[PDB]
Amino acid sequence: TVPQCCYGFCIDLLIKLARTMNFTYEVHLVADGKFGTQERVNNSNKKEWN
Amino acid sequence: LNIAVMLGHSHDVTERELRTLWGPEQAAGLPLDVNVVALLMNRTDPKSLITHVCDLMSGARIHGLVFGDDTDQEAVAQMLDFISSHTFVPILGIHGGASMIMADKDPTSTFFQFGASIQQQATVMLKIMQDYDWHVFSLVTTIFPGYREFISFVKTTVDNSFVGWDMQNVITLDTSFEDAKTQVQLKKIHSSVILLYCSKDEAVLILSEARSLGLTGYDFFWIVPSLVSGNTELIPKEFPSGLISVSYDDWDYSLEARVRDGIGILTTAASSMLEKFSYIPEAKASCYGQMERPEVPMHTLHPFMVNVTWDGKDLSFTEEGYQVHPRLVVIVLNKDREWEKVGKWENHTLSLRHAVWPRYKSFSDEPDDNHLSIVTLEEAPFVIVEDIDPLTETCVRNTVPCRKFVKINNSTNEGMNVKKCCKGFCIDILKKLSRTVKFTYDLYLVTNGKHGKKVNNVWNG
Amino acid sequence: DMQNVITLDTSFEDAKTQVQLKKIHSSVILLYCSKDEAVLILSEARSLGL
Amino acid sequence: KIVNIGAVLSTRKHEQMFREAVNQANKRHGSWKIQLNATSVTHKPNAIQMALSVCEDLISSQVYAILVSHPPTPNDHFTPTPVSYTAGFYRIPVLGLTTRMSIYSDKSIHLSFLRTVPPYSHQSSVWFEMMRVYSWNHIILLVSDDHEGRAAQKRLETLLEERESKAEKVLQFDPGTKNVTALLMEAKELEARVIILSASEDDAATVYRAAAMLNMTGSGYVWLVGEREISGNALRYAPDGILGLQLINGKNESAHISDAVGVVAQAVHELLEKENITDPPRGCVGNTNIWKTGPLFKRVLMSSKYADGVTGRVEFNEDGDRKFANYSIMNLQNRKLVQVGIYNGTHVIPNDRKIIWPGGETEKPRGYQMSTRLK
User: At which residues is glycosylation annotated (chain A)?
Assistant: First the structure.
């Protein structure tokens, strides 16, 4: 887990909301790189959001 | 070292001493001189329980417990809690109420009973809905406490199913003998397969009321497990063809085969004792005495009943004392109101059946003649025949299975009716005719000829 | 749009009637009876909820 | 006609109170010439035995119903399982007079066993009232991992999500857990300080030490406490201003005798109104036969209403627990209980005594404390 530079639309928006909304933002990378859907875990029934 | 056995009046005690000698001379010949006190009775009677407890706790502190009775009272098996927790001796329930498990097993109880693993029941029922593709439901319980359990089973296991089981909701009869509110609730059932969890006399009420509803018609279906069948030896009168129970009965088994199985189970757990100990906690000294404590310093069989196999059968139990490979003798009433076997569940708890879909066949007729024998050719894209994918069922969204005749050899030409998935124009059209002409259409495939040949005008295909 | 003329056969059947009366599946209910038959039917359809 | 009715107590003086209430039962609007003879045995010293009196003495005298306290010491593991389940053979209706162990509510096994005193899980519902007394939305649920605890969870999770209020955390506990300090640091992660508490005494007491130890006790940190935790050292490590609960007439067991005998007498007269009154077997030998009127006893007792109880309306739930039992809600303040809350069952009556919120002041707090720290 390295903290790495990030660039984009959403950063601009979050800083807009830091201004208009007064929050701090705790920004991380996905281990999956994925949205993660309801999929079944072993025992083959456990429909869980990933 | 010792096993106690008390039975419903059945196959004899001399026969039991023969079974004891046969199990003792069978295999792994017992460094523990394992010795059994066995009888036949008819009582659900707690004074009789007290007598047999005090006599056999006083009598040499008997160490094993095997019980299959000829009764049905379930709560006496829950009254075995006081033996399992006032003698702390493991209890094998096989028949009687001792089969009948509504005992939600305690940390103090020492139950291992061969019967109503309710979870395994639910999974079997669901695979019954699988294996002739009965996706379309109608669900009726009553509100015996403990049926809300089954309601939670249905909710979870359908919602844990991507199969998409077609739900008609659990229409619960509130109290018996409402008889107007019941049939108000019973005109809310609008499908074929009717799935029941009740008592027996409630089922007398419901079949009487549904013969007035016509829901006992003989394209409907009715799968009612051993809660209401109980004794397959008990076949009451309003109870037609195609009634289906699942039960660990001595139809596939005997008493004494199960007995020698369970005695060997006890001695393998005792072997794991003498592995991990070299000692055995005996039974308590007395009934009425609270002597020091119940500190089982030599630690009864709950870690030792973890690993037991007999003779290729994984006769280990669950942590809740249910069978790891259950038996689940699935027995079906027929036209003559005859409990006859269909399914078995011993191989990875997988279904073991006869491929007989239609069985609702004029018991209390309600004769149903709508089934239209349609045997065609594979004619793409009018007929495009797929196979069964292992796609959690045999269910592709637009397919119907079609029983081909798959010959065994070129010599043994026995065309085995293999259900195969099916699509195409004409299948869409037959779906449209199920939507307009609205019948049942019996789909098979042509082997002998193609369309028809004038083989001296003996038509083929 | 037709829901068919569901005729009560004789009065005081009271089980066959409500078997025939769970066959009514729409809003506007169009009646040709006697008066005491209508007492029966409104009593029965307040039990039906119709 | 003679109905033998059991009574399992510690004393025989209140068994005589049953005898005299049985006299009143023959008197008060109940008609029989000898429709009652009195049967009453105290709690037994061996909790093994528990059926000697019952089969040898009570069922042999054809006792229809038995009225049992907790025990003669009421405080060990002598919560009365064995007499109950020996009455659990053949559908024999029994009323738990004082009991709050909702293990006994489990009607799948507790077939014929209804309670004049509602258990702790009914207390679950009461907290919902105070939700709407105090407008809460951020919720700390704390459950010693119990069948009663999880049944109370069921009542809570229903009565939440019926009105769609949503719990933040349900942390779960064995009894004896003292390294809850990890679960406590989990509790340091929240807006919520609404601390809803269910365990025994000692779990609670160590957690009061450890949480006070965290610091975790300041205004806001509102301790919402089950009554097992309103005894022993759970008294003695908890801070001050803490809400506790009380059932009013939870302990006037003389009033429980009076109410129970009036109820069961007029229910017997409801039984004699019925037809085909099946017989009580005498022997627990040869009599393999369930009460057929077992479920008819249940239909009598569920459908009989008694507004004329001394404890109020002796009128039960669906579960056979009395509806609208009076509540009084308490505040250890310098560990000195300060009554505020009173209920008919549902009617909010805060006493004029103020709630010092169980760290700081008398001000209705906030489990709503934002972080502005967005993961």
Answer: 22, 42
Please answer yes or no on whether A28 and D374 come within 8 Å at the CB atom: no
Rounded distance, CA D247 to CA D327, Å?
A: 5
SS3 D266: helix
Which residue out of A16, A24, A30 would a mutagenesis test of the D interface target, given it has the greatest number of D Cβ atoms within 10 Å? A24
What is the number of helices (H) and of strands (E) in chain C? 2, 0
After what residue numbers is chain C broken, C–N > 2.5 angstroms? none
Which chains sit next to D, with 3 or more Cβ pairs under 8 A?
A, B
CB pairs under 8 A between B and D: 72
Beta bridge partners of B64: B3
Tell me which amino acid residue D195 is.
I
Closest CA to B86 of D86, D96, D75: D86
CB B218 within 8 A of CB B368: yes
DSSP secondary structure string for all residues of D82-151: HHHHHSTTTT--EEESS---GGGG-TTT-TTEEESS--HHHHHHHHHHHHHHHT--S-EEEEES-HHHHH
User: SS3 breakdown of chain D: % helix, strand, coil, rounded to 5?
Assistant: 35, 20, 50
CB count in 10 Å sphere of residue D121: 23
Q: Residue A35: what residue type?
A: F
Encode burial over B187-223: b for 16+ CB neighbours within 10 A, e otherwise: bebebbbbbbbbebebbbbbbebbeebebbbbebbbb
**Are the C-beta atoms of B99 and B93 separated by less than 8 Å?**
yes
Query: What is the side-by-side strand order in the sheet with B64-68?
Result: B35-41, B2-8, B64-68, B91-95, B111-113
As a whole number of angstroms, the distance between CA B273 and CA B310 comes to 17
Q: Is the peptide bond before B381 cis (omega within 30 degrees of 0)?
A: yes
B11 is in an annotated binding site: yes
Which method, experimentally, gave rise to this model? cryo-EM
Give the other-Cβ count within 10 Å of B443's Cβ.
22
Distance CA A3, CA B63 (A): 64
D9: its two tokens: 């107590």
R_g of chain C computed on alpha carbons: 10
**Residues 6 or more apart in contact with residue B303 via CB below 8 angstroms:** none
Token couple for B283: 């039974």
SS3 content of chain C, % helix, strand, coil (to 5): 40, 0, 60
> Could you give phi then psi for residue B326, rounded to 5 degrees?
-75, 170
Separation between Cα atoms, residue B305 and residue B177, nearest integer Å: 45
| SS3 category, B102 | coil
| Residues in D lying within 8 Å of A, measured between beta carbons | 372-375
All residues of chain B having their beta carbon less than 8 Å from the beta carbon of residue C13 are none
Q: How far is CA C33 from the centre of its chain?
A: 10
Mutate to test the interface with D, among B6, B9, B41, B44 (most CBs of D within 10 A): B44
Nearest residue to C19 via CA among C32, C30, C9 = C9
Any idea which residue has 């099916």 for tokens?
B422
10 Å CB burial of residue D208 (0-12, 13-18, 19+) is buried
The breaks in chain D (C to N more than 2.5 Å) occur after none
Strands D113-115 and D94-96: parallel
Cα distance between residue D122 and residue B152, in whole Å: 22
Question: CA C25, C27, C29: angle at the middle one, nearest 5?
Answer: 90
Q: Which residues of A touch B350 (CB under 8 A)?
A: none
CA of D50, closest CA in chain B: separation in Å? 10
Crossing angle, helix B118-131 and helix B147-159, to 10 degrees? 50
Least CA distance to D372: which residue of chain A? A23
Would the CB atoms of D374 and A22 count as touching at under 8 Å?
no
